[PDB]
Amino acid sequence: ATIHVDGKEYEVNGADNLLEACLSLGLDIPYFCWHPALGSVGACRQCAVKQYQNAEDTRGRLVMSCMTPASDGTFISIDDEEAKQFRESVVEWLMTNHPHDCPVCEEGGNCHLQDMTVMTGHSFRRYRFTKRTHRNQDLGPFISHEMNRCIACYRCVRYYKDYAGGTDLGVYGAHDNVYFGRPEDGTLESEFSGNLVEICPTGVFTDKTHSERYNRKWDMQFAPSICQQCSIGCNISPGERYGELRRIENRYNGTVNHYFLCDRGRFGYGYVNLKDRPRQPVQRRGDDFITLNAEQAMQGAADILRQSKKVIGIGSPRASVESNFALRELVGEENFYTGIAHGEQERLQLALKVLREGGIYTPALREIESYDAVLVLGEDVTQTGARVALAVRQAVKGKAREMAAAQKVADWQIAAILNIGQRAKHPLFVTNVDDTRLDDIAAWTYRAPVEDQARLGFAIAHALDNSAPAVDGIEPELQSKIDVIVQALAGAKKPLIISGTNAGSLEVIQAAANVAKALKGRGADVGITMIARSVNSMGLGIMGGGSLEEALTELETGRADAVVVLENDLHRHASATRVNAALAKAPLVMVVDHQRTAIMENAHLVLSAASFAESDGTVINNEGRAQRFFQVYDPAYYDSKTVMLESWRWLHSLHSTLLSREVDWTQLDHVIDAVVAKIPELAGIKDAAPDATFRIRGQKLAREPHRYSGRTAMRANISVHEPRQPQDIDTMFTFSMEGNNQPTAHRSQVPFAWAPGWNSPQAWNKFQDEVGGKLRFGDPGVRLFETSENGLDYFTSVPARFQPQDGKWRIAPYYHLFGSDELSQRAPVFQSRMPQPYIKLNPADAAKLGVNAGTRVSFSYDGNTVTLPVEIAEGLTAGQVGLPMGMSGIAPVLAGAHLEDLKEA
Amino acid sequence: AFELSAAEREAIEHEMHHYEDPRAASIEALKIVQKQRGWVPDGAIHAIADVLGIPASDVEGVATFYSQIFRQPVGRHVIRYCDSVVCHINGYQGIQAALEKKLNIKPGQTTFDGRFTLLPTCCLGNCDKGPNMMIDEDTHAHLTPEAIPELLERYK
Amino acid sequence: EATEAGLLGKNIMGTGFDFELFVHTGAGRYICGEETALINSLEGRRANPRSKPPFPATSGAWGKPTCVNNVETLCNVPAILANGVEWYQNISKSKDAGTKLMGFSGRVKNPGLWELPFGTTAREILEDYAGGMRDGLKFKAWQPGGA
Numbered sequence A: 001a002t003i004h005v006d007g008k009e010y011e012v013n014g015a016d017n018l019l020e021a022c023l024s025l026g027l028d029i030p031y032f033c034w035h036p037a038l039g040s041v042g043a044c045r046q047c048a049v050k051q052y053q054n055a056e057d058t059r060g061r062l063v064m065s066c067m068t069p070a071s072d073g074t075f076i077s078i079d080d081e082e083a084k085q086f087r088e089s090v091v092e093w094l095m096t097n098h099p100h101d102c103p104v105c106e107e108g109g110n111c112h113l114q115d116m117t118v119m120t121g122h123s124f125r126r127y128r129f130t131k132r133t134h135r136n137q138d139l140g141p142f143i144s145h146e147m148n149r150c151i152a153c154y155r156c157v158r159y160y161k162d163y164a165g166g167t168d169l170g171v172y173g174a175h176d177n178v179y180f181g182r183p184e185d186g187t188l189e190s191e192f193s194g195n196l197v198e199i200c201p202t203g204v205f206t207d208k209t210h211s212e213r214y215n216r217k218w219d220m221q222f223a224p225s226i227c228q229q230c231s232i233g234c235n236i237s238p239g240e241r242y243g244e245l246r247r248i249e250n251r252y253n254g255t256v257n258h259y260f261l262c263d264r265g266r267f268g269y270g271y272v273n274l275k276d277r278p279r280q281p282v283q284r285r286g287d288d289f290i291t292l293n294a295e296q297a298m299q300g301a302a303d304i305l306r307q308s309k310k311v312i313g314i315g316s317p318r319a320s321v322e323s324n325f326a327l328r329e330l331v332g333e334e335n336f337y338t339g340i341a342h343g344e345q346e347r348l349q350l351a352l353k354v355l356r357e358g359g360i361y362t363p364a365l366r367e368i369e370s371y372d373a374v375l376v377l378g379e380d381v382t383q384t385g386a387r388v389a390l391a392v393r394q395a396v397k398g399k400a401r402e403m404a405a406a407q408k409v410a411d412w413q414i415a416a417i418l419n420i421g422q423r424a425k426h427p428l429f430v431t432n433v434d435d436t437r438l439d440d441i442a443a444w445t446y447r448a449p450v451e452d453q454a455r456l457g458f459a460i461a462h463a464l465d466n467s468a469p470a471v472d473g474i475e476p477e478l479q480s481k482i483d484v485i486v487q488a489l490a491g492a493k494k495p496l497i498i499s500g501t502n503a504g505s506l507e508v509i510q511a512a513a514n515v516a517k518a519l520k521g522r523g524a525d526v527g528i529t530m531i532a533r534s535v536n537s538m539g540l541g542i543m544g545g546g547s548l549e550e551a552l553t554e555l556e557t558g559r560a561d562a563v564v565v566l567e568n569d570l571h572r573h574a575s576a577t578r579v580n581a582a583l584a585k586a587p588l589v590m591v592v593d594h595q596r597t598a599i600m601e602n603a604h605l606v607l608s609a610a611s612f613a614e615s616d617g618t619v620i621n622n623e624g625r626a627q628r629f630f631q632v633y634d635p636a637y638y639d640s641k642t643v644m645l646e647s648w649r650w651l652h653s654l655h656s657t658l659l660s661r662e663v664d665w666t667q668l669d670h671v672i673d674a675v676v677a678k679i680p681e682l683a684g685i686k687d688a689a690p691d692a693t694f695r696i697r698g699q700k701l702a703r704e705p706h707r708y709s710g711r712t713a714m715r716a717n718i719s720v721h722e723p724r725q726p727q728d729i730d731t732m733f734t735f736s737m738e739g740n741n742q743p744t745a746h747r748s749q750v751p752f753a754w755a756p757g758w759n760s761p762q763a764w765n766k767f768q769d770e771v772g773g774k775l776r777f778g779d780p781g782v783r784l785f786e787t788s789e790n791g792l793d794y795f796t797s798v799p800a801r802f803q804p805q806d807g808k809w810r811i812a813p814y815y816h817l818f819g820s821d822e823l824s825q826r827a828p829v830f831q832s833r834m835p836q837p838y839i840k841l842n843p844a845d846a847a848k849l850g851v852n853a854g855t856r857v858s859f860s861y862d863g864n865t866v867t868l869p870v871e872i873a874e875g876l877t878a879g880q881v882g883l884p885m886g887m888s889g890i891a892p893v894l895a896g897a898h899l900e901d902l903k904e905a
Numbered sequence B: 001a002f003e004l005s006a007a008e009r010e011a012i013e014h015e016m017h018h019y020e021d022p023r024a025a026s027i028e029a030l031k032i033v034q035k036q037r038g039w040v041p042d043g044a045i046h047a048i049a050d051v052l053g054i055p056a057s058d059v060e061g062v063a064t065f066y067s068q069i070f071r072q073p074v075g076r077h078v079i080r081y082c083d084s085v086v087c088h089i090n091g092y093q094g095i096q097a098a099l100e101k102k103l104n105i106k107p108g109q110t111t112f113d114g115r116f117t118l119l120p121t122c123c124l125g126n127c128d129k130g131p132n133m134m135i136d137e138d139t140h141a142h143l144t145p146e147a148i149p150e151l152l153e154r155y156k
Numbered sequence C: 001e002a003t004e005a006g007l008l009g010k011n012i013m014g015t016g017f018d019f020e021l022f023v024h025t026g027a028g029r030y031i032c033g034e035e036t037a038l039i040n041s042l043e044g045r046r047a048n049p050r051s052k053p054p055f056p057a058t059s060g061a062w063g064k065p066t067c068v069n070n071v072e073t074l075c076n077v078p079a080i081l082a083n084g085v086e087w088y089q090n091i092s093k094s095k096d097a098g099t100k101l102m103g104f105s106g107r108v109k110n111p112g113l114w115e116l117p118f119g120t121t122a123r124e125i126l127e128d129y130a131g132g133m134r135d136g137l138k139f140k141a142w143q144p145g146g147a
């Protein structure tokens, strides 16, 4: 199809919208109510152009660009007199009742209404009457509400209801006293409410975490990084100022995390600006905690490691590939232990086996939305990694999209699609120990013990293919729903199976692999996704190594007298008393970390590592793709006594001082070469981003905008002499604004989206070849995984039923989004969002114990009787007890374990 | 502490039977609650959301969208005088001044007895019969300012 | 009365056509009269209208084909199928066929509502059926349809 804009020919798509066709060509049409991921409505009338019938026409007709199809032979005009003055009138009407509080507003240079008011060229005011006001609401710890700034373009309610599936936001009121919010005052309980900050083109929904310690957009030093909070690895843009990380924004990537984050990754950045973090190397003798610089710490640590008889390195699933490899080179391969439990490592290894050896394609986050029937086995997807759950919601809405496409209505008008749909949902079958947040859209929810979910998966695989092992003891009332799932998955063109290592059982992974293989046997386009625990747990599994238990036995046995723990708390993956005894028995304990953990006490040497804001590194997604995160700022720019170096830098210099008695502050690309030369299966990590000697037309890329203010007074409170800019020799980025952030630049990684006339987060559409699609010049991160030619075998190990036993209790994980991450609980803004430490009991189990809901109970684990308040779980089963993993005192490895002495306190 | 009565719940379920969706019965459920208790309180929104299945935000949006769903406590009798054009030509300002003089209130306000609530109305649909005003499902036409205290004193 | 007398129910006059009728009293908004906003209000939503060219005739209430017709529109059609077709075209010598409930309103001698064929001049209605202006009014303006 071809169109004619201003008497100029253009070749656009015919099946898409005219507004997005014009915005894909680099043309500027103002818009408020249209979003590339939310369809098109007429809540504003901002995208008005003048359409003609044939080539020779003068009068025209004012149509909406977002509601006109971009069919073959259209003749539209954008910048004629009538459309321009009508759009000026529309911004005048929207700004007729708008508060005069732009300098005291949170948006400022991030506001879309400012850009579209300037773009339409409306400066003079002739409205002399009174304005309109509304009362504000308390939306929780993350979203500040300022309803007076609203222009009623309905984008927030459309996202929150249609896209996010939330039940909090909504439209109230009437003609002009319209309202967008909650019916009462309270916290937005959806896990995607943080996307309302950038979805709203005005300052209504703003970031409270960025409201505290606020700076403008041009004052932010940005970097492209990867969210370290769970395994989805959503591309983020952290931006800092004055030496502290201030706001994480969305970073566009049309393959993973196009437009929307989750609340955990959006608001769990508070742990990197804690004032109790290690900033300098600290060494203890007796009770004296003295402070060294980098060189003395390396010399002393190399001396003690040389005098030791055996060194062991305990890596972490939160550190980068470079840091874990640097530990793997500091210590031997024969003694290098991944800091995870044996069962969790086994689950991770079999999940990796299903990924890179199951012969079955694993989809990325964007293409989850194209599947036709989703079966989630064991995983609380909406609470562990919620972005896959949002993509599952979109995949469920794909059936309404298909029914609309059968009636030949265009795909960009979502109102007609939702009209045709009317609760027509793709089959979603979620299994969990209790209720999920996906139960409102799921075709069926299976509340059962974890072994029963595994047997359900094995029964599904057997009924889909008789070569799979059979299950004995299935009740016919459950066999009917088994048959329902079987005919739902068999008739699906693209079935999707979701599992993960957080389920706490090997057999759930086995059953999910069996179901995927049975669907692949009958010629279906089945995909599988597995939600891992941490950001780089899959990379640690690819790297491999022993478990944490083997390291502990090596510690109390006495075979190893030196331990180097890289960025691990060591209480989440093993019991606290055993780890404490093993570390106290060790003559030398080194802890390379950026968070003040519990094991840093009685640790003979502490290296102040760097977080994702202050380090460069590579992390592997749950799907297997290896993306890389860049340093945001130099920690030594302000208060230069702190060194705060990269973890791989610390370990490489320690290895160099161990070998040649001299330090070697190496480069990132040297470590990348070492990884791709030593580990053959990690050879793809030199394809995510180019080297540090990569320039677009001879210049680097700027971390900060061209209007970065206050350069000569930023450090003036401690030194009036302006220091030299920090030199970034590791990567392709410069720490000043003397770089390149042009949208038409041959690169894949963008620190921040800014275009002239587009100062909002809606400047990402200038950085893409087509808007709402993939990013221009490719996408960051390469897949690193190829589908095997042949699959695995049918896993014959089918577990038995869960029989409750007297005097013992099976522990079931719950995995809250705001409280089951080690780096998220340390954020001061999350502490009001996590629930109180609780324990769930069945009504029958509570009646047997005689305990009423809300009162304390006492249970003993590792010889420690702890008291927690109970609450009644209707969906839980008898003989089980429920716990929130990841919390303080409740390790994530406690899932699937036993419990004793549930006595009332 | 809102609690739906048995008759209200049976009426809501019976209206739910008439449609393809309980969401279609949301508006009639709000009208049933308004008829029974004079107005729709804050807990009634969650009660309708619980009996139906739709979110409470949708129920609140429906309750605050339509004009004759009162979310504030009103009097025992709602006076609804016509604000439109034909009643402006026939004269509604005289009867509005008469109502304001008799009740000593403003439109949108209620009397201190909790008896009358004065409100304007979009249109009564009885334009050919002079000025129009509706009190408690009873329309009144051919109105004059001098006939307002007589028409007001026959109500409870 | 219709569902008592065999009408409006199931197997109407032995035909086998099942049709049942409801009355949905609105909660009061002027926008609800628009057909797409009528559909949205009938579905118990906020009565915001919808966008054409997806029409109610192809996708209306709950995604099903519906049509919305006025009371007068549905009330002329029993006369068409009870009296005839050419009779309906031959009651007025104009291309707007049928009869319409015309009538003047607002400070006239006889405000009311009269059924007249199309092509009747407004001066005829005002000076004959409505009775014209009262003693002292000069008729400076009028609207064909109200407001």
Ligand code: SF4
Binding pocket: A149, A150, A151, A152, A153, A154, A155, A156, A157, A180, A199, A200, A201, A202, A204, A205
């Ligand atoms: S609150 Fe923001 S997103 Fe919602 S309608 Fe108003 S301007 Fe649009």
Ligand code: SF4
Binding pocket: A098, A099, A100, A101, A102, A105, A106, A107, A108, A111, A112, A113, A114, A149, A201, A202, A203, A204
């Ligand atoms: S939302 Fe935008 S236009 Fe409104 S006060 Fe804030 S900066 Fe100004």
Ligand code: SF4
Binding pocket: A227, A228, A229, A230, A231, A232, A233, A234, A261, A262, A263, A264, A265, A266, A384, A385, A386, A387, A388
């Ligand atoms: S889904 Fe996971 S990776 Fe993505 S923003 Fe949330 S916590 Fe971060």
Ligand code: FES
Binding pocket: A019, A030, A031, A032, A033, A034, A041, A042, A043, A044, A045, A046, A047, A048, A064, A065, A066, A067
């Ligand atoms: S962008 Fe709002 S009318 Fe098109």
Ligand code: FES
Binding pocket: B082, B083, B084, B085, B086, B087, B088, B123, B124, B125, B126, B127, B128, B131, B132
């Ligand atoms: S103008 Fe008042 S009844 Fe219509």
Ligand SMILES: [Ca+2]
Binding pocket: A615, A616, A631, A728, A730
């Ligand atoms: Ca660096």
